[PDB]
Curated annotation (Swiss-Prot):
The keyword Cytoplasm does not apply. The active site is at D33, D213. The lineage of its organism: Eukaryota, Sar, Alveolata, Apicomplexa, Aconoidasida. GO terms for cellular component: cytostome; food vacuole; lysosome; vacuolar lumen; vacuolar membrane. Its main location: membrane. The chain holds residues 126 to 453 of 453 of the full protein. This is Plasmepsin II.
Amino acid sequence: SNDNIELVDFQNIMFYGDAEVGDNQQPFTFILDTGSANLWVPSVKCTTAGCLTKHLYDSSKSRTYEKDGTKVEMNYVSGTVSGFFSKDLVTVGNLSLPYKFIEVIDTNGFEPTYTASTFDGILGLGWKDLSIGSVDPIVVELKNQNKIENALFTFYLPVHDKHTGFLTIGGIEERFYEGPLTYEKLNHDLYWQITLDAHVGNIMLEKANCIVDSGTSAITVPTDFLNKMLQNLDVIKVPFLPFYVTLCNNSKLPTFEFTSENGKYTLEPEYYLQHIEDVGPGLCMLNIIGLDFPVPTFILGDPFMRKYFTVFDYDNQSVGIALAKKNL
Ligand SMILES: Cc1cc(N(C)CCN(C)C)cc(C)c1OCC(=O)N[C@@H](Cc1ccccc1)[C@H](O)C(=O)N1CSC(C)(C)[C@H]1C(=O)N[C@H]1c2ccccc2C[C@H]1O
């Protein structure tokens, strides 16, 4: 059997899951992020305003706590947290392991994201060589300890109103998907990144890097490619922000089509549009952001993963992709 962690939707933009730290089972809510490779929780030693409404970690209450204290700063694209390393029993679903994590004491570099969102910490689901402190990934460690069948995990993302989701550790369950499951070989050692041809109508990018990322709540697109997409599309940019607004029923809005020799994955407007009726009637925001990597790259974030069930397979160094079942 497999370890199943339930995923709760947060206003159709993101999702969260719970896990515990300490032998007294101190509860936390996590962003589960395939794009990073460290676990962190806010500490009772936290000095900053963000920590005020969070579940906090108290090492003195856990008899399995092992002191480390090495200083560490965790830099993400959207901000920084700092604190120090600690080690304790981490439990995910019904499995436990001793695990090295970051006790965060300063979250001021992660504002306003942190105070506005209802997560306590971030649980990384990436590769070891992307971690600070050379930490073996949780799922690799669980496999090594014979607590799961395979060194893989899967995401069946919740759909607002329709159903909850699951992060499943250790194997692939048929209940989550329909049609074929296609495996795409990783093109990098330490990112969940695959090679796909990216088509949006006339515009194409041959053999683009495509990162499948659970922690990114948009599709990201190279800026040049995006500028070509938005030309004559009747969308308007929000002042001061990298977001475009449209009429929801704008007939011009294209369908993303990513292809390999193995498979074909499409993303229609209904999957990348976000209603903003409160802002104005019949108005939608595109969940699409222009971003230039050194090599042309798309991030296939939460909107892609809402449509597609995904398998992250360490042993076979690949990402599996299938159409998510509309219900459970
Ligand atoms: C950890 C790390 C270490 C090293 N190093 C140096 C390691 C070296 N080691 C040996 C010490 C080098 C790198 C690059 C690295 O990755 C940094 C990192 O931030 N990666 C992001 C993915 C990404 C990557 C590139 C460009 C955009 C996004 C992460 O996985 C994620 O998903 N994050 C951050 S925190 C969050 C909230 C979980 C969510 C995030 O920011 N989400 C926001 C976002 C982002 C883009 C577009 C829209 C939106 C809306 C919102 O969802």
